[PDB]
């Protein structure tokens, strides 16, 4: 599960990055030139507009997205296999994933590098009508971390914001599972006695 | 007073009727029998704007300052990963992790090949 | 097809579409003899 | 009428200097809370717009000013009780409002975050 | 099943003369699969195992 | 050095149950919310719930058939002799067994061992007035054994300390908060229900499929009595411009003319309803035509009704059936029944002027959310609800239920009256004639409640579902035992619904509703479980000092401002609208209310009140300074940084609120406030899970679950107990690697496992993926082994 | 900038009474004043040939606000102020006391 | 676009702006019978193609100009049997079924599809899986051992 | 319930030496690995089995049937 | 399909096969000429200034967006918006009006004491997967 000094620290400066892409994509939706700050007064407002239409943060979340992911598949690209302590085919967390005998490289990458984007139903994370996706952010915050985006893996740990919108996620499969009243069960019976 | 349409007595507080409802030259409150009009209130009229939202529009959303619409080309899923295509052989495809049917059941994991567009549900 | 008594007693008709029928219950399927039910568990010696 | 008990009729009322000539006259309105005493204060420092401040025993004040419905009354005579004010109703020249501020202390950062 | 929601249903009862010994002479209480752990994602439960080896040492 | 596990301690208190003040009181600290609402149904100030709700059910009316025989036409309109009934106090006595004579102190042990309940003697003061008073019988009539809740005010536990307990059959550190039925412990769910006292802007597609012309939007205020009895008053826009009042008696729903129960309550102008809804905000052409459509169809409607008595007697006429308030009861009187009985319950009687003033602010509120100056208040929401308390639904049926008693009473004389005619109402005779042929077991009647957990009530309260309000306290192991007095549901009539919004796991939540413990399947985000340092607030004090400090702070008052919209805010403390004032300086109070709060200097002012601030917006939520200090909130301790002290939120003023994590993570100018510990959040048993900030999501969800399945320890008193089924393990083991509240809670009482040499090891061929291997000489040595 | 007091009274003078907005009146009618006695209450009434005026003070506005109004000079510099207690007063009409049946079939 | 409205004295008050929004969003400038939207979606394995969301094809046929005639598809099938005949909508059948499996990523095979609507398109008609359908078997027992 | 008779990995007798340990710990005022190293018990599944012992006899012992208060 | 062979399907859907002398920006017009187009979908703003004189005056505004606007964006003409309001609009907006003052005089007010209609396998549905 552990990466090497030389994979950890090509890690740490790709997700170095991911700090300034919170607010990049923020003043892109928003249409505003040379990159108004993350305080900015008319910035601020031009959120709000979003924050109250599904519409605008939508074309918001997947801006955001798309380039956060982006940061994240750089992550994932440079530190596995390359950045790795221990190796195939004596890295057996590895091993398992390419052979087909159980997990994948997706499970690997959330183990040894980010969990990634939170991503809840279709879109980033919920957000309230005070313009704040939890207590401890600022309303209307331009910040990756605010929207979901875990930089944390679960080798070292993921911090409790990252914890709370993993939570989110993490239920919202099951939630699908718990409302879906489509069954099989009719269809085929129907085709069977008619073709028997 | 009087404010927009409505017509308000001095006295009471009531509202006054419409003066083309009850009878010619002189009107009256239905509290107090006020002796009404002074025929200097003139004929009001009432500047009714549209909700500005009540016509959603693809034009009106090209005015609305802030982006409304992302481009056709210019469409990106999540994340990519190092996992082969099964239909043509890309080494890049999006990914997405969802937990489907239990908490005891494992993780369930959807690929999008970056270069088709092929879909592709696997557990493990 | 007959009046209320102050559920009613079944009918030769509710007997034959009690739940899913005589015919699905007890024609196309069956309870069956010389046949046994237990927990599976793995065995890669066999 | 009569009721409710326990109610006794004014009789005495002191004179209101109302002229309104016009170099002109000028009616104001003050708010003020029941811990501070009026008689006390012999002065109140005041200023245009909501810009304000006072301080009356360790208690700090703020005379907030508002440009903009209420009716004064003002007695003509003793005897004639209370009547309605007007010059061709009447309303006040300024309106005040005295409201009681705390300075809220500013957080000791140094102190509570901590490495 | 451990506090880390890895539950397994007892496929054997495994005799300790057939079970893998420690260079210690320690045979395991209880064995987990190692293709358990890369879908569950319980990391919790791997630091779990050398945190309790050095409060037990 | 280390954050060691407590072997010395522990074993010397196994041996010496303390005789003092118990021990882990976070355990006593989680059964707050339970018997706490149960102990304030008769201790606390006004004579508890109890008295309280004997005193808003009130009289019942009846007439004898005997005539006047005076020297008239008097004689005709002479309905006889007048007898109203009431009960003044209600008593509750501990368990005791008389055998006849001399009374003895029955202790739990021996209901579960006996295998009956645990019943406390109910006594209520009748009254019996003829003619108004002019002759009163008073009698204590017994009214059966209404079962008694454990460690509660009427249990003989709550006194007792550790060694005491044991000595009575009983654990240690016994909690309580569940009542002994036919042997079977139960306990009452909590539930989630509308915040009350606030007006909610709401859009429901429910509301247009009822009536004609009827749109999505709506205001709905959950009004609550101090008897903690509901009464939910809607408000409806129709596409005509036309308001509608909709209210529900028995278990029918009633419209009414908002303009009507307007000036029902006081004597208005229609420019005091104008002036009232529409301030300073005369322009707005939007508010000028509704306004209009609302005063001239009352004028159109009911040109007849001109002064406050005429549209009372209306009231009256039209509502004498039923709210059943007959045969002398003036429409006058009828007319304030219905009002005083039904319009804004939580100002009460004597406060029609605060019913106007609230009534106007939820008409200027609902044109605020059709012209979409307000979004729509979301009911599934942390922020807009509160928890219904077990001990509080189990006083709102007894209410019921006596009023019912009352009711047999009077159908016991009617029947008297209808035939033999018999005797007079002076006569003690009589009424203990009539008392000893009426159902007084209100016991068995609650006993029922307590062991189907099916609602039978007239009224139906102001809830959705009628059963599963009692569940069984499953006590397979401590830790599904706890949970359970954690546990809060939604409601059994959302788990029926398409909606997904309702299971969604939402920010609002933080603090209050734990974001792990929450089952599997069908009970997804339905069945929550709260944070462990989650409280829930049992009444309310010192919040009659409020609005002397806020009039001081510059709020002008509401009587004299007259002037009402979002341009400006709106203070209100419990739903009552005490003045007006600007955004700007209804911040400055906000601010500086809590600064005083959190400060022991200031008498007049809770630690335990929130204050509710909502800042204007672009079409965002109605802004105002909405205070709360009254039962059922949702609060949480949080370190204030001036000062550095223990501050408590509640989850509608957390919303605009900077909390920062950790304290190194505090901004400048942006943060107000910093947590404790972030553990705050989880729940008791997501707490226990050991590194659970390194786990996936669904693995920490499903631990909850499997611990709560496990076969531990489920008691140390069980030579006494006599349970359908218990599950327990013999060797029982301290975890090495263990969260530090698993001491705080003392579960090293009740051990849920053993620790175990497990090898992460593919070696026999037998264990992959849902199976795993034991050791054979380990479970020959006892390893693992129940009973 | 410090204005100067000239005089203060606490005694009955001149009051405060509103009504609602757009409120005239005949101009000629008197209001009767009335007192109770920590905080004093009062109690206004006014009668005319139409209408009739009623007005009493706020409960939890009296013991927490103390209202006052004084007349400014422009050159003196110089308020006298005068204890005036605020009215909420309504006005009944010569409709009011009407009234059917107590009990209507 | 400027109209005045004079109505009558006893008309009195009346939301007009409420009404008017109503019915411009209920009147149609332009609108093909049974069409709502057409849009230009990205070829599809390098076919340039239209997505209608509505189905006329009579009102397409006089598009020959820009469309296709002999290749207009559509996912309704008792519209393409109502124009085209059984053998249209028997392969309409199999071609939606195949677009149901291969969105999942499941391949079924063809002989299975092709059975199916084939046993749908019996009577020349457009026969579902139920009661309706299986109205036309020779078998009482069968019919019984159904519902 | 009681001490285990043998450690559940190995099969070392444990039963004998929890009265002993907790001797160890209050007279002796020894930490919790020197103690156990003085019982001799040097394998960690031994060490764990005293070392974790609960003893909820004792506790269970409190309710006697047989004894009046 | 299958189950139901329904002739009123909820997605109905014609894919068209366009040539290749007809270009991107050829095919995106006639994608416009098809798709239905409302007078919403033109509008701007509407100003009703209610005036009452001698009769209720209602001076409608239709303020519209730019006449080269929507005939990029719709594939509308001046000419196609006038034969809408003169033909169908007027004649709508007239019948909505007549049914507005009928429904007025109808129903003066909801009755007040009659009731009105009410706005809105436990345990199987509080069991968890587990269970
Ligand atoms: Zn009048
Ligand atoms: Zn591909
Ligand atoms: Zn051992």
């Given at each position: 599960?552990?990466?090497?000094?030389?994979?950890?620290?090509?890690?740490?400066?790709?997700?170095?990055?991911?700090?300034?892409?919170?607010?990049?994509?923020?003043?892109?939706?928003?249409?505003?030139?040379?990159?108004?700050?993350?305080?900015?007064?008319?910035?601020?407002?031009?959120?709000?507009?979003?924050?109250?239409?599904?519409?605008?943060?939508?074309?918001?979340?997947?801006?955001?997205?798309?380039?956060?992911?982006?940061?994240?598949?750089?992550?994932?690209?440079?530190?596995?296999?390359?950045?790795?302590?221990?190796?195939?085919?004596?890295?057996?967390?590895?091993?398992?994933?390419?052979?087909?005998?159980?997990?994948?490289?997706?499970?690997?990458?959330?183990?040894?590098?980010?969990?990634?984007?939170?991503?809840?139903?279709?879109?980033?994370?919920?957000?309230?009508?005070?313009?704040?996706?939890?207590?401890?952010?600022?309303?209307?915050?331009?910040?990756?971390?605010?929207?979901?985006?875990?930089?944390?893996?679960?080798?070292?740990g993921?911090?409790?914001?990252?914890?709370?919108?993993?939570?989110?996620?993490?239920?919202?499969?099951?939630?699908?599972?718990?409302?879906?009243?489509?069954?099989?069960?009719?269809?085929?019976?129907?085709?069977?006695?008619?073709?028997? | 007073?009087?404010?927009?349409?409505?017509?308000?007595?001095?006295?009471?507080?009531?509202?006054?009727?419409?003066?083309?409802?009850?009878?010619?030259?002189?009107?009256?409150?239905?509290?107090?029998?006020?002796?009404?009009?002074?025929?200097?209130?003139?004929?009001?009229?009432?500047?009714?704007?549209?909700?500005?939202?009540?016509?959603?529009?693809?034009?009106?959303?090209?005015?609305?300052?802030?982006?409304?619409?992302?481009?056709?080309?210019?469409?990106?899923?999540?994340?990519?990963?190092?996992?082969?295509?099964?239909?043509?052989?890309?080494?890049?495809?999006?990914?997405?992790?969802?937990?489907?049917?239990?908490?005891?059941?494992?993780?369930?994991?959807?690929?999008?090949?970056?270069?088709?567009?092929?879909?592709?549900?696997?557990?493990? | 097809?007959?009046?209320?008594?102050?559920?009613?007693?079944?009918?030769?008709?509710?007997?034959?579409?009690?739940?899913?029928?005589?015919?699905?219950?007890?024609?196309?399927?069956?309870?069956?003899?010389?046949?046994?039910?237990?927990?599976?568990?793995?065995?890669?010696?066999? | 009428?009569?009721?409710?008990?326990?109610?006794?009729?004014?009789?005495?009322?002191?004179?209101?200097?109302?002229?309104?000539?016009?170099?002109?006259?000028?009616?104001?309105?003050?708010?003020?809370?029941?811990?501070?005493?009026?008689?006390?204060?012999?002065?109140?420092?005041?200023?245009?717009?909501?810009?304000?401040?006072?301080?009356?025993?360790?208690?700090?004040?703020?005379?907030?000013?508002?440009?903009?419905?209420?009716?004064?009354?003002?007695?003509?005579?003793?005897?004639?009780?209370?009547?309605?004010?007007?010059?061709?109703?009447?309303?006040?020249?300024?309106?005040?409002?005295?409201?009681?501020?705390?300075?809220?202390?500013?957080?000791?950062?140094?102190?509570?975050?901590?490495? | 099943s451990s506090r880390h929601g890895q539950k397994?249903?007892?496929?054997?009862?495994?005799?300790?003369?057939?079970?893998?010994?420690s260079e210690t002479g320690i045979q395991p209480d209880i064995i987990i699969?190692?293709?358990?752990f890369?879908?569950?994602?319980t990391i919790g439960m791997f630091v779990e195992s050398l945190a309790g080896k050095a409060g037990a040492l | 050095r280390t954050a060691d596990f407590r072997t010395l301690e522990r074993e010397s208190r196994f041996?010496?149950?303390?005789?003092?003040?118990?021990?882990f009181?976070?355990?006593?600290?989680?059964?707050?919310?339970?018997?706490?609402?149960?102990?304030?149904?008769?201790?606390?100030?006004?004579?508890?719930?109890?008295?309280?709700?004997?005193?808003?059910?009130?009289?019942?009316?009846?007439?004898?058939?005997?005539?006047?025989?005076?020297?008239?036409?008097?004689?005709?309109?002479?309905?006889?002799?007048?007898?109203?009934?009431?009960?003044?106090?209600?008593?509750?006595?501990?368990?005791?067994?008389?055998?006849?004579?001399?009374?003895?102190?029955?202790?739990?042990?021996?209901?579960?061992?006996?295998?009956?309940?645990?019943?406390?003697?109910?006594?209520?003061?009748?009254?019996?007035?003829?003619?108004?008073?002019?002759?009163?019988?008073?009698?204590?009539?017994?009214?059966?054994?209404?079962?008694?809740?454990?460690?509660?005010?009427?249990?003989?536990?709550?006194?007792?300390?550790?060694?005491?307990?044991?000595?009575?059959?009983?654990?240690?550190?016994?909690?309580?908060?569940?009542?002994?039925?036919?042997?079977?412990?139960?306990?009452?769910?909590?539930?989630?229900?509308?915040?009350?006292?606030?007006?909610?802007?709401?859009?429901?597609?429910?509301?247009?499929?009822?009536?004609?012309?009827?749109?999505?939007?709506?205001?709905?205020?959950?009004?609550?009595?101090?008897?903690?009895?509901?009464?939910?008053?809607?408000?409806?826009?129709?596409?005509?411009?036309?308001?509608?009042?909709?209210?529900?008696?028995?278990?029918?729903?009633?419209?009414?003319?908002?303009?009507?129960?307007?000036?029902?309550?006081?004597?208005?102008?229609?420019?005091?309803?104008?002036?009232?809804?529409?301030?300073?905000?005369?322009?707005?052409?939007?508010?000028?035509?509704?306004?209009?459509?609302?005063?001239?169809?009352?004028?159109?409607?009911?040109?007849?009704?001109?002064?406050?008595?005429?549209?009372?007697?209306?009231?009256?006429?039209?509502?004498?059936?039923?709210?059943?308030?007959?045969?002398?009861?003036?429409?006058?009187?009828?007319?304030?029944?219905?009002?005083?009985?039904?319009?804004?319950?939580?100002?009460?009687?004597?406060?029609?002027?605060?019913?106007?003033?609230?009534?106007?602010?939820?008409?200027?509120?609902?044109?605020?959310?059709?012209?979409?100056?307000?979004?729509?208040?979301?009911?599934?929401?942390?922020?807009?609800?509160?928890?219904?308390?077990?001990?509080?639904?189990?006083?709102?049926?007894?209410?019921?239920?006596?009023?019912?008693?009352?009711?047999?009473?009077?159908?016991?004389?009617?029947?008297?009256?209808?035939?033999?005619?018999?005797?007079?109402?002076?006569?003690?005779?009589?009424?203990?004639?009539?008392?000893?042929?009426?159902?007084?077991?209100?016991?068995?009647?609650?006993?029922?409640?307590?062991?189907?957990?099916?609602?039978?009530?007239?009224?139906?309260?102001?809830?959705?579902?009628?059963?599963?309000?009692?569940?069984?306290?499953?006590?397979?192991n401590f830790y599904?035992?706890?949970?359970?007095?954690?546990?809060?549901?939604?409601?059994?009539?959302?788990?029926?619904?398409?909606?997904?919004?309702?299971?969604?796991?939402?920010?609002?939540?933080?603090?209050?509703?734990?974001?792990?413990?929450?089952?599997?399947?069908?009970?997804?985000?339905?069945?929550?479980?709260?944070?462990?340092?989650?409280?829930?607030?049992?009444?309310?004090?010192?919040?009659?000092?409020?609005?002397?400090?806020?009039?001081?702070?510059?709020?002008?008052?509401?009587?004299?401002?007259?002037?009402?919209?979002?341009?400006?805010?709106?203070?209100?403390?419990?739903?009552?609208?005490?003045?007006?004032?600007?955004?700007?300086?209804?911040?400055?109070?906000?601010?500086?209310?809590?600064?005083?709060?959190?400060?022991?200097?200031?008498?007049?002012?809770?630690?335990?009140?929130?204050?509710?601030?909502?800042?204007?917006?672009?079409?965002?939520?109605?802004?105002?300074?909405?205070?709360?200090?009254?039962?059922?909130?949702?609060?949480?301790?949080?370190?204030?940084?001036?000062?550095?002290?223990?501050?408590?939120?509640?989850?509608?003023?957390?919303?605009?609120?900077?909390?920062?994590?950790?304290?190194?993570?505090?901004?400048?100018?942006?943060?107000?406030?910093?947590?404790?510990?972030?553990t705050?959040?989880?729940?008791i048993l997501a707490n226990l899970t050991p590194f659970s900030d390194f786990n996936?999501?669904?693995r920490n969800?499903?631990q909850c679950?499997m611990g709560?399945?496990t076969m531990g320890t489920?008691?140390?008193?069980?030579?006494?107990?006599?349970?359908?089924?218990?599950?327990?393990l013999q060797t029982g083991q301290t975890p090495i690697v263990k969260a530090n509240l698993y001491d705080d809670y003392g579960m090293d009482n009740f051990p849920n496992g053993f620790n175990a040499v497990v090898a992460v090891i593919?070696?026999?061929?037998?264990?992959?993926?849902?199976?795993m291997?034991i050791n054979?000489?380990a479970?020959?040595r006892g390893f693992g082994y129940?009973? | 900038?410090?204005?100067?007091?000239?005089?203060?009274?606490?005694?009955?003078?001149?009051?405060?009474?509103?009504?609602?907005?757009?409120?005239?009146?005949?101009?000629?009618?008197?209001?009767?004043?009335?007192?109770?006695?920590?905080?004093?209450?009062?109690?206004?009434?006014?009668?005319?040939?139409?209408?009739?005026?009623?007005?009493?003070?706020?409960?939890?506005?009296?013991?927490?606000?103390?209202?006052?109004?004084?007349?400014?000079?422009?050159?003196?510099?110089?308020?006298?102020?005068?204890?005036?207690?605020?009215?909420?007063?309504?006005?009944?009409?010569?409709?009011?006391?009407?009234?059917?049946?107590?009990?209507?079939? | 676009?400027?109209?005045?409205?004079?109505?009558?004295?006893?008309?009195?008050?009346?939301?007009?702006?409420?009404?008017?929004?109503?019915?411009?969003?209920?009147?149609?400038?332009?609108?093909?019978?049974?069409?709502?939207?057409?849009?230009?979606?990205?070829?599809?394995?390098?076919?340039?193609?239209?997505?209608?969301?509505?189905?006329?094809?009579?009102?397409?046929?006089?598009?020959?100009?820009?469309?296709?005639?002999?290749?207009?598809?559509?996912?309704?099938?008792?519209?393409?049997?109502?124009?085209?005949?059984?053998?249209?909508?028997?392969?309409?059948?199999?071609?939606?079924?195949?677009?149901?499996?291969?969105?999942?990523?499941?391949?079924?095979?063809?002989?299975?599809?092709?059975?199916?609507?084939?046993?749908?398109?019996?009577?020349?008609?457009?026969?579902?899986?139920?009661?309706?359908?299986?109205?036309?078997?020779?078998?009482?027992?069968?019919?019984?051992?159904?519902? | 319930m009681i001490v285990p008779?043998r450690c559940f990995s190995c099969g070392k007798?444990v039963g004998?030496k929890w009265?002993s340990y907790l001797?160890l710990l209050?007279?002796?005022?020894l930490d919790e690995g020197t103690a156990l190293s003085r019982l001799g018990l040097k394998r960690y599944c031994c060490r764990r089995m005293i070392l974790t012992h609960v003893d909820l006899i004792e506790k269970?012992?409190?309710?006697?049937?047989?004894?009046?208060? | 399909?299958?189950?139901?062979?329904?002739?009123?399907?909820?997605?109905?859907?014609?894919?068209?096969?366009?040539?290749?002398?007809?270009?991107?920006?050829?095919?995106?017009?006639?994608?416009?000429?098809?798709?239905?187009?409302?007078?919403?979908?033109?509008?701007?703003?509407?100003?009703?200034?209610?005036?009452?004189?001698?009769?209720?005056?209602?001076?409608?505004?239709?303020?519209?967006?730019?006449?080269?606007?929507?005939?990029?964006?719709?594939?509308?003409?001046?000419?196609?918006?006038?034969?809408?309001?003169?033909?169908?609009?007027?004649?709508?907006?007239?019948?909505?009006?007549?049914?507005?003052?009928?429904?007025?005089?109808?129903?003066?007010?909801?009755?007040?004491?009659?009731?009105?209609?009410?706005?809105?396998?436990?345990?199987?549905?509080?069991?968890?997967?587990?269970?």
């Amino acid at each position: 599960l552990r990466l090497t000094a030389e994979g950890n620290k090509w890690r740490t400066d790709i997700l170095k990055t991911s700090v300034d892409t919170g607010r990049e994509a923020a003043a892109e939706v928003t249409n505003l030139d040379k990159d108004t700050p993350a305080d900015d007064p008319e910035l601020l407002k031009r959120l709000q507009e979003i924050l109250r239409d599904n519409n605008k943060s939508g074309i918001l979340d997947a801006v955001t997205s798309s380039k956060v992911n982006a940061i994240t598949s750089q992550v994932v690209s440079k530190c596995v296999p390359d950045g790795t302590m221990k190796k195939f085919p004596c890295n057996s967390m590895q091993a398992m994933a390419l052979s087909g005998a159980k997990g994948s490289n997706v499970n690997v990458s959330q183990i040894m590098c980010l969990l990634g984007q939170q991503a809840l139903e279709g879109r980033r994370v919920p957000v309230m009508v005070s313009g704040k996706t939890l207590p401890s952010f600022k309303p209307y915050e331009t910040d990756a971390m605010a929207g979901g985006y875990v930089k944390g893996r679960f080798y070292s740990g993921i911090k409790p914001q990252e914890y709370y919108f993993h939570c989110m996620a993490g239920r919202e499969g099951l939630i699908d599972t718990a409302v879906k009243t489509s069954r099989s069960g009719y269809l085929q019976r129907c085709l069977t006695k008619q073709l028997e | 007073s009087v404010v927009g349409s409505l017509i308000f007595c001095l006295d009471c507080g009531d509202l006054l009727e419409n003066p083309n409802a009850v009878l010619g030259s002189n009107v009256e409150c239905s509290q107090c029998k006020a002796i009404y009009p002074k025929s200097q209130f003139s004929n009001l009229k009432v500047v009714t704007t549209t909700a500005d939202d009540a016509f959603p529009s693809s034009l009106r959303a090209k005015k609305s300052v802030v982006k409304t619409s992302l481009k056709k080309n210019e469409l990106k899923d999540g994340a990519t990963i190092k996992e082969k295509c099964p239909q043509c052989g890309n080494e890049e495809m999006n990914y997405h992790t969802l937990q489907l049917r239990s908490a005891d059941e494992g993780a369930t994991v959807f690929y999008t090949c970056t270069s088709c567009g092929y879909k592709f549900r696997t557990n493990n | 097809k007959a009046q209320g008594r102050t559920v009613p007693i079944p009918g030769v008709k509710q007997a034959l579409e009690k739940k899913e029928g005589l015919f699905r219950k007890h024609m196309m399927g069956k309870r069956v003899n010389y046949a046994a039910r237990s927990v599976i568990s793995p065995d890669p010696n066999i | 009428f009569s009721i409710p008990d326990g109610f006794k009729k004014c009789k005495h009322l002191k004179n209101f200097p109302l002229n309104g000539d016009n170099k002109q006259q000028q009616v104001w309105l003050i708010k003020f809370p029941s811990n501070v005493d009026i008689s006390k204060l012999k002065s109140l420092p005041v200023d245009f717009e909501s810009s304000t401040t006072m301080t009356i025993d360790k208690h700090d004040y703020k005379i907030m000013d508002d440009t903009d419905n209420m009716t004064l009354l003002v007695p003509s005579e003793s005897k004639e009780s209370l009547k309605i004010a007007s010059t061709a109703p009447l309303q006040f020249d300024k309106v005040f409002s005295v409201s009681e501020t705390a300075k809220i202390p500013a957080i000791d950062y140094s102190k509570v975050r901590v490495p | 099943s451990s506090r880390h929601g890895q539950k397994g249903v007892c496929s054997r009862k495994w005799p300790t003369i057939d079970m893998p010994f420690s260079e210690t002479g320690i045979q395991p209480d209880i064995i987990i699969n190692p293709h358990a752990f890369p879908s569950r994602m319980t990391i919790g439960m791997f630091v779990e195992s050398l945190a309790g080896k050095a409060g037990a040492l | 050095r280390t954050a060691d596990f407590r072997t010395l301690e522990r074993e010397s208190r196994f041996i010496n149950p303390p005789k003092d003040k118990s021990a882990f009181p976070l355990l006593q600290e989680a059964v707050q919310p339970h018997i706490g609402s149960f102990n304030a149904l008769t201790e606390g100030p006004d004579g508890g719930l109890l008295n309280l709700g004997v005193k808003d059910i009130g009289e019942k009316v009846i007439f004898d058939g005997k005539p006047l025989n005076s020297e008239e036409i008097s004689n005709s309109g002479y309905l006889g002799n007048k007898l109203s009934v009431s009960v003044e106090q209600v008593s509750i006595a501990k368990p005791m067994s008389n055998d006849s004579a001399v009374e003895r102190k029955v202790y739990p042990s021996e209901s579960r061992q006996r295998l009956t309940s645990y019943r406390g003697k109910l006594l209520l003061k009748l009254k019996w007035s003829v003619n108004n008073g002019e002759e009163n019988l008073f009698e204590v009539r017994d009214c059966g054994g209404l079962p008694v809740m454990l460690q509660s005010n009427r249990c003989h536990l709550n006194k007792m300390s550790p060694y005491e307990l044991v000595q009575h059959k009983e654990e240690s550190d016994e909690i309580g908060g569940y009542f002994i039925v036919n042997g079977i412990e139960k306990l009452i769910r909590m539930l989630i229900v509308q915040r009350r006292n606030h007006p909610m802007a709401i859009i429901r597609p429910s509301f247009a499929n009822r009536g004609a012309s009827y749109s999505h939007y709506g205001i709905q205020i959950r009004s609550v009595r101090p008897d903690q009895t509901s009464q939910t008053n809607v408000l409806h826009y129709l596409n005509d411009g036309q308001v509608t009042f909709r209210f529900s008696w028995r278990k029918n729903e009633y419209l009414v003319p908002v303009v009507m129960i307007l000036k029902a309550l006081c004597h208005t102008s229609d420019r005091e309803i104008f002036d009232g809804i529409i301030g300073n905000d005369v322009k707005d052409s939007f508010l000028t035509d509704r306004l209009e459509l609302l005063l001239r169809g009352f004028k159109k409607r009911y040109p007849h009704l001109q002064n406050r008595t005429q549209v009372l007697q209306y009231l009256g006429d039209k509502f004498r059936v039923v709210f059943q308030a007959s045969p002398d009861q003036s429409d006058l009187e009828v007319g304030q029944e219905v009002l005083d009985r039904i319009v804004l319950v939580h100002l009460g009687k004597d406060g029609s002027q605060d019913k106007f003033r609230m009534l106007l602010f939820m008409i200027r509120k609902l044109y605020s959310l059709v012209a979409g100056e307000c979004s729509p208040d979301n009911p599934d929401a942390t922020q807009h609800q509160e928890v219904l308390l077990g001990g509080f639904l189990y006083g709102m049926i007894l209410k019921e239920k006596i009023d019912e008693y009352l009711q047999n009473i009077i159908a016991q004389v009617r029947m008297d009256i209808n035939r033999g005619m018999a005797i007079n109402f002076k006569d003690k005779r009589y009424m203990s004639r009539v008392l000893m042929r009426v159902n007084e077991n209100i016991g068995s009647k609650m006993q029922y409640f307590l062991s189907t957990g099916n609602l039978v009530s007239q009224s139906g309260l102001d809830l959705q579902q009628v059963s599963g309000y009692t569940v069984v306290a499953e006590k397979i192991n401590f830790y599904r035992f706890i949970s359970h007095f954690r546990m809060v549901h939604r409601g059994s009539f959302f788990a029926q619904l398409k909606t997904t919004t309702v299971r969604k796991l939402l920010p609002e939540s933080w603090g209050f509703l734990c974001p792990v413990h929450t089952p599997d399947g069908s009970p997804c985000g339905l069945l929550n479980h709260f944070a462990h340092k989650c409280r829930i607030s049992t009444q309310q004090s010192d919040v009659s000092r409020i609005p002397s400090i806020l009039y001081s702070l510059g709020v002008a008052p509401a009587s004299h401002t007259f002037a009402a919209g979002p341009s400006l805010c709106c203070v209100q403390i419990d739903g009552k609208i005490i003045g007006w004032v600007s955004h700007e300086q209804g911040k400055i109070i906000a601010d500086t209310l809590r600064y005083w709060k959190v400060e022991g200097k200031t008498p007049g002012l809770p630690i335990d009140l929130e204050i509710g601030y909502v800042p204007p917006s672009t079409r965002g939520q109605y802004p105002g300074l909405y205070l709360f200090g009254g039962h059922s909130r949702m609060l949480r301790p949080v370190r204030y940084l001036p000062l550095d002290k223990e501050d408590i939120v509640g989850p509608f003023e957390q919303v605009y609120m900077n909390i920062a994590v950790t304290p190194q993570e505090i901004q400048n100018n942006v943060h107000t406030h910093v947590e404790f510990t972030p553990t705050n959040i989880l729940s008791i048993l997501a707490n226990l899970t050991p590194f659970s900030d390194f786990n996936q999501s669904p693995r920490n969800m499903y631990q909850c679950q499997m611990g709560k399945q496990t076969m531990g320890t489920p008691g140390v008193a069980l030579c006494h107990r006599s349970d359908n089924k218990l599950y327990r393990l013999q060797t029982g083991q301290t975890p090495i690697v263990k969260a530090n509240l698993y001491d705080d809670y003392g579960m090293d009482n009740f051990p849920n496992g053993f620790n175990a040499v497990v090898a992460v090891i593919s070696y026999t061929g037998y264990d992959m993926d849902d199976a795993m291997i034991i050791n054979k000489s380990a479970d020959e040595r006892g390893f693992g082994y129940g009973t | 900038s410090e204005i100067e007091i000239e005089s203060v009274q606490d005694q009955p003078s001149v009051a405060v009474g509103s009504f609602f907005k757009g409120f005239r009146a005949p101009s000629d009618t008197t209001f009767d004043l009335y007192k109770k006695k920590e905080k004093d209450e009062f109690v206004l009434h006014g009668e005319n040939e139409r209408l009739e005026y009623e007005g009493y003070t706020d409960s939890s506005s009296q013991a927490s606000n103390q209202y006052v109004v004084g007349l400014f000079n422009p050159e003196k510099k110089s308020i006298q102020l005068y204890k005036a207690p605020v009215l909420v007063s309504k006005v009944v009409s010569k409709s009011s006391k009407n009234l059917r049946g107590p009990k209507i079939k | 676009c400027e109209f005045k409205l004079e109505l009558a004295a006893d008309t009195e008050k009346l939301l007009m702006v409420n009404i008017v929004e109503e019915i411009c969003r209920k009147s149609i400038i332009r609108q093909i019978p049974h069409i709502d939207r057409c849009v230009h979606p990205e070829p599809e394995n390098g076919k340039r193609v239209l997505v209608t969301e509505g189905v006329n094809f009579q009102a397409m046929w006089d598009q020959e100009a820009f469309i296709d005639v002999d290749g207009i598809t559509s996912n309704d099938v008792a519209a393409v049997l109502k124009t085209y005949g059984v053998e249209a909508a028997r392969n309409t059948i199999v071609n939606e079924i195949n677009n149901v499996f291969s969105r999942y990523a499941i391949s079924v095979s063809f002989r299975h599809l092709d059975l199916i609507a084939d046993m749908m398109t019996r009577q020349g008609t457009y026969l579902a899986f139920n009661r309706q359908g299986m109205e036309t078997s020779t078998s009482s027992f069968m019919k019984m051992s159904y519902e | 319930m009681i001490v285990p008779v043998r450690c559940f990995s190995c099969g070392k007798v444990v039963g004998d030496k929890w009265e002993s340990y907790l001797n160890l710990l209050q007279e002796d005022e020894l930490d919790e690995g020197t103690a156990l190293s003085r019982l001799g018990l040097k394998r960690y599944c031994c060490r764990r089995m005293i070392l974790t012992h609960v003893d909820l006899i004792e506790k269970f012992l409190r309710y006697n049937p047989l004894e009046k208060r | 399909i299958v189950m139901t062979a329904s002739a009123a399907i909820k997605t109905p859907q014609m894919t068209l096969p366009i040539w290749n002398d007809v270009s991107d920006e050829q095919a995106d017009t006639f994608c416009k000429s098809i798709s239905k187009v409302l007078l919403s979908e033109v509008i701007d703003k509407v100003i009703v200034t209610e005036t009452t004189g001698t009769a209720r005056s209602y001076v409608i505004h239709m303020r519209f967006f730019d006449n080269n606007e929507y005939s990029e964006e719709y594939d509308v003409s001046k000419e196609e918006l006038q034969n809408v309001i003169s033909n169908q609009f007027i004649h709508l907006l007239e019948a909505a009006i007549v049914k507005e003052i009928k429904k007025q005089k109808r129903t003066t007010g909801p009755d007040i004491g009659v009731a009105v209609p009410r706005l809105q396998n436990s345990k199987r549905l509080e069991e968890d997967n587990d269970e």
